[PDB]
Structures are given as structure tokens and as C-alpha cells.
Design an enzyme around this catalytic site. Structure first.
Site, mmCIF file in Angstrom:
data_model
loop_
_atom_site.group_PDB
_atom_site.id
_atom_site.type_symbol
_atom_site.label_atom_id
_atom_site.label_comp_id
_atom_site.label_asym_id
_atom_site.label_seq_id
_atom_site.Cartn_x
_atom_site.Cartn_y
_atom_site.Cartn_z
ATOM 1 N N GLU A 50 -4.775 -3.160 -7.476
ATOM 2 C CA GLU A 50 -5.161 -3.829 -6.247
ATOM 3 C C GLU A 50 -6.155 -4.939 -6.514
ATOM 4 O OE1 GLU A 50 -3.886 -3.663 -3.394
ATOM 5 O OE2 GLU A 50 -3.018 -1.605 -3.195
ATOM 6 N N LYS A 78 0.647 4.023 -2.679
ATOM 7 C CA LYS A 78 -0.409 5.011 -2.804
ATOM 8 C C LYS A 78 0.055 6.427 -2.629
ATOM 9 C CE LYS A 78 -3.631 1.349 -1.413
ATOM 10 N NZ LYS A 78 -4.675 0.944 -0.452
ATOM 11 N N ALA A 129 0.969 -3.973 3.986
ATOM 12 C CA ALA A 129 1.210 -5.381 4.280
ATOM 13 C C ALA A 129 0.803 -6.175 3.047
ATOM 14 C CB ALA A 129 0.457 -5.819 5.517
ATOM 15 N N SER A 148 0.792 -1.210 0.000
ATOM 16 C CA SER A 148 0.000 0.000 0.000
ATOM 17 C C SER A 148 0.837 1.278 0.000
ATOM 18 C CB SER A 148 -0.977 0.015 1.207
ATOM 19 O OG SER A 148 -1.861 -1.096 1.110
ATOM 20 N N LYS A 188 2.684 6.230 5.705
ATOM 21 C CA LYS A 188 1.811 5.247 5.079
ATOM 22 C C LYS A 188 2.412 3.847 5.274
ATOM 23 C CE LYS A 188 -1.624 3.611 2.722
ATOM 24 N NZ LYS A 188 -1.805 2.609 3.794
ATOM 25 N N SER A 218 -6.440 3.318 3.796
ATOM 26 C CA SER A 218 -6.047 2.124 3.044
ATOM 27 C C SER A 218 -7.199 1.495 2.265
ATOM 28 C CB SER A 218 -5.438 1.149 4.048
ATOM 29 O OG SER A 218 -4.304 1.680 4.731
#
Ligand SMILES: OC[C@H]1O[C@H](O[C@H]2[C@H](O)[C@@H](O)[C@H](OCCCCCCC3CCCCC3)O[C@@H]2CO)[C@H](O)[C@@H](O)[C@@H]1O
Length: 265
Positions: free
Chosen positions: A141, A48, A212, A45, A209, A105
Site C-alpha cells: 500500500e 486484505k 477503490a 483493498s 470488503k 480499511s
């Protein structure tokens, strides 16, 4: 606490996976601590933040507005959509999507944003436009989290990610207001920010940020410093470890402790 490098080594040993880390001065770009800094790690993540940098670049160019409302449908949603699942009927602005992606997230928000910047290929092109010839996004994603051994897809290096974050936040590639917005989204992270503050000494700044992924992959990109100032970028990635999430979190916190206790370098 051990010296920071010693603590990173201890963490890598205890986790039985690879750790990658950089500590960089935000203002000057000097590298203070480095460990496996040119090795690849899945971004998860953490990508982002770069994504919303690419969005902001479009806004600055007159090609995008943070106010623009994106309409989407249920079939567009992927796993982990805590904000975006609430707005099927009324949509979300581009800026609201960046806030959801960075601070909550939200994976579907990140995919909607990816579609505005030309997809993974568009985001990789933006990375090259800002002089990052290493980091790459290949998938959307949630597949980008697969973290296959040796696979270069969807990876960065600690050194490249740190340099890229510094470029986005400070180099005047983004406008003054856009730099301020990107920073503010990191300041407002709800997933890890308040947790980190609960264990930081009084007076220490954090913006961050986290991510995982599969096979133990875990990371954080952060701004940290004393006297309520964002003095340093700290990038830590873990990969190929069987450790519990709690233990991964604790080892990252232990590296943080070592940095705080040996800050004057
Ligand atoms: O002398 C320095 C400080 O030493 C201790 O602070 C401890 C603190 O009580 C503990 O909770 C933290 O754990 C580490 C918490 C780190 C949090 C996450 C770090 C992340 C974010 C930045 C990216 C790297 C990882 O360590 C520090 C340093 O020993 C004292 O409690 C504090 O009064 C004192 O000011």
C-alpha cells in the site's frame, strides 16, 4: 429490475468502463452469474481478506499468534491509517491489525501484516499454495492501487477471487476457529456494511470488503443471502470508468437489487 446479467450489462454501459462479476454458491461453489469472470481487475483493498487468510494459515501452523504485538513507527505509516496512527506508542496485535485492515480499511495495518507473511511475494506464494494460480500481489500500500491499463500487477479475476474466498472460508484449509475469524472480520466491516444494511430488505445477510483505486477502479467482495444466511459469494469489480463514486456505488447497488429480485436460480 432487469435480470442480473442484463443489469450488469446496463451498468457497464452507463459507467463507460469494464465490469467483472461472479455470483457463486458458498456451499457448493457453483457459478450462477458470470460476466468478464476471467478478465483481470485491480483488487485494491479487497486483497486484505486474502492477506488475513494467509495470516490465519500461519496461526494454524503454529508460526504466528493473533495476540502477538507489532511495534511500529511513524515513518511506517502510509495514507489512510485511521486506526494505526493511534497506536504508535502501544502497538497493535496481529489480530487487531487484521481487524483494522478489513473493517476500517487501514492501509498501514495491511502493510504491517504483509511484512508478517513475506510481503507481496509471500502472499502470492500463499495463493499458489491454495490453488489460486491467477491472483497476484506485487506491491505494497498504496502503490498497489495504481490500476494502470493492461498491467497485471495486483490483480485478480472475479472467478479466481470468488473461488479463493470460498476456499478460505469453507474448505478446511484454515482451522474451524480461523474460518470463523475471517468471516467475522467481514461481518464487522464498518466502511460499507452498515450502509449496505440500510438498503437491504429485512432478512438479508451481508458481509463484505470494498475497495477503490485509480482510474475509477472500485470493487466489492461479499457474502449475501436471504433468511439471515450467507448463501452466495458476490464479487464485483469496476475499472477504467470516469464515473463519480456515487454513481459507481449506485450501479453496484443496482446489480444487488437485480440479484435480490431474481434470486431463485
Ligand atoms: O421483494 C424483494 C424486496 O424488494 C425490495 O427491496 C429492494 C430494496 O428496497 C432496495 O433498497 C434494494 O436496493 C439494492 C441494495 C443492494 C445493496 C448492495 C449490494 C452489494 C452487496 C452484495 C454484493 C453485490 C452488491 O433492492 C431491493 C430489491 O429490489 C423491497 O423493498 C423489499 O421489501 C422486498 O423484500
Amino acid at each position: 429490475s432487469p435480470q442480473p446479467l442484463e443489469q450488469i450489462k446496463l451498468s457497464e454501459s452507463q459507467l463507460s468502463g469494464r465490469v467483472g462479476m461472479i455470483e457463486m454458491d458458498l456451499a457448493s461453489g457453483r457459478t450462477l452469474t458470470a460476466w468478464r469472470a476471467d478478465e483481470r481487475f485491480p483488487m485494491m483493498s479487497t486483497f486484505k481478506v486474502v492477506l488475513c487468510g494467509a495470516v490465519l494459515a500461519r496461526v494454524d501452523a503454529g508460526d504466528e499468534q493473533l495476540e502477538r504485538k507489532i511495534h511500529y513507527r511513524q515513518q511506517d505509516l502510509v495514507d489512510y491509517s485511521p486506526v494505526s496512527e493511534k497506536h504508535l506508542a502501544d502497538g497493535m496485535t496481529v489480530g487487531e491489525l487484521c481487524a483494522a485492515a478489513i473493517t476500517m480499511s487501514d492501509n498501514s495495518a495491511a502493510n504491517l501484516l504483509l511484512a508478517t507473511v513475506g510481503g507481496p511475494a509471500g502472499l502470492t506464494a500463499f495463493l499458489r499454495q491454495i490453488g489460486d494460480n491467477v491472483t497476484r500481489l506485487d506491491r505494497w500500500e498504496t502503490e498497489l492501487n495504481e490500476a494502470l491499463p493492461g498491467d497485471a500487477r495486483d490483480t485478480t479475476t472475479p472467478a479466481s477471487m470468488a473461488a479463493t474466498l470460498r476456499k478460505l472460508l469453507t474448505s478446511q484449509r484454515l482451522s474451524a476457529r480461523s474460518q470463523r475469524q475471517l468471516l467475522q472480520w467481514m461481518v464487522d466491516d464498518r466502511v460499507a456494511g452498515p450502509l449496505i444494511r440500510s438498503v437491504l430488505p429485512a432478512g438479508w445477510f451481508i458481509a463484505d470488503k470494498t475497495g477503490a483505486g485509480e482510474r475509477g477502479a472500485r470493487g466489492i467482495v461479499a457474502l449475501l443471502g436471504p433468511n439471515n444466511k450467507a448463501e452466495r459469494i458476490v464479487v464485483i469489480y469496476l475499472r477504467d470508468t470516469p464515473a463519480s463514486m456515487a454513481e459507481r456505488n449506485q450501479q453496484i447497488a443496482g446489480i444487488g437489487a437485480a440479484l435480490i429480485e431474481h434470486w431463485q436460480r
